[PDB]
């Protein structure tokens, strides 16, 4: 039937491998997948999107621009949603940080054009610095 759950057997394997930080000592666990699923529904976003390569991309599109003015909860979300998203796409990052650079490049590639991503937005930022 249709696809269920967030991370399948294979995804779960790599998921447990990925670490929250590039130089930390706390690998990823289901605790983080559920922690976000409960926080997502709070933002009018169903947890069913976490199990969709498309949903994850959308969820990140709302937190991306809200990273600077986003509370600790927002930051944590963009992190988990990142490591997970990379799994539903193809990217096999080792840490959450890497997942940010991978997704940042994909979106940055569009910046060069700024033809479709420069109509709905009101005031874009011309000062992008690395974390
Ligand atoms: C307060 C006592 C009660 C807490 C129990 C709370 C209930 C619970 O167990 O929830 C799970 C967890 C929060 O609890 P949890 O203790 O694991 O919190 C995370 C932990 O302290 C990490 O070491 C922090 O990373 P860093 O060393 O600073 O990089 C991370 O980010 P920051 O907010 O500290 O920056 C913290 O969120 O949820 C998430 O947000 C994970 C999202 C993935 C984020 C991955 C990090 C990039």
UniProtKB/Swiss-Prot annotation:
Post-translational modification: Tyrosine phosphorylated presumably in the virion by a host kinase. Phosphorylation is apparently not a major regulator of membrane association.
Membrane topology classification: Lipid-anchor
Annotated stretches, region: Interaction with Gp41: 6-30
Chain positions covered by the region annotation Interaction with membrane phosphatidylinositol 4,5-bisphosphate: 72-76
Region Interaction with host AP3D1, residue ranges: 11-18
Region spans: Interaction with membrane phosphatidylinositol 4,5-bisphosphate and RNA: 13-32
Subcellular location: Virion membrane; Host nucleus; Host cytoplasm
Residue interval(s) of motif Nuclear localization signal: 25-31
Region (Interaction with host CALM1) location: 7-42
Position of sequence motif Nuclear export signal: 15-21
PTM annotation (Phosphotyrosine): residues: 131
Lipid attachment locations (N-myristoyl glycine): 1
Substitution effect: residue 66 to A: Loss of ability to fuse with target cell membranes and infect host cell
Residue span of region Disordered: 105-127
General function of this protein: Targets the polyprotein to the plasma membrane via a multipartite membrane-binding signal, that includes its myristoylated N-terminus. Matrix protein is part of the pre-integration complex. Implicated in the release from host cell mediated by Vpu. Binds to RNA.
Subunit structure: Homotrimer; further assembles as hexamers of trimers. Matrix protein p17: Interacts with gp41 (via C-terminus). Interacts with host CALM1; this interaction induces a conformational change in the Matrix protein, triggering exposure of the myristate group. Interacts with host AP3D1; this interaction allows the polyprotein trafficking to multivesicular bodies during virus assembly. Part of the pre-integration complex (PIC) which is composed of viral genome, matrix protein, Vpr and integrase.
Name this polypeptide is given: Matrix protein p17
Native species: Human immunodeficiency virus type 1 group M subtype B (isolate NY5) (HIV-1)
């Amino acid at each position: 039937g249709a696809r269920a759950s967030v991370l399948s057997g294979g995804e779960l394997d790599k998921w447990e491998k990925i670490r929250l930080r590039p130089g930390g000592k706390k690998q990823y666990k289901l605790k983080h997948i559920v922690w976000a699923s409960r926080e997502l529904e709070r933002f009018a976003v169903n947890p069913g999107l976490l199990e969709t390569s498309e949903g994850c991309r959308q969820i990140l599109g709302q937190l991306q621009p809200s990273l600077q003015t986003g509370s600790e909860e927002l930051r944590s979300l963009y992190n988990t949603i990142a490591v997970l998203y990379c799994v539903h796409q193809r990217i096999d990052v080792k840490d959450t940080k890497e997942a940010l650079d991978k997704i940042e490049e994909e979106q940055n590639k569009s910046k060069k054009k700024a033809q479709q991503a420069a109509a709905d937005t009101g005031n874009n930022s011309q000062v992008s610095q690395n974390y």
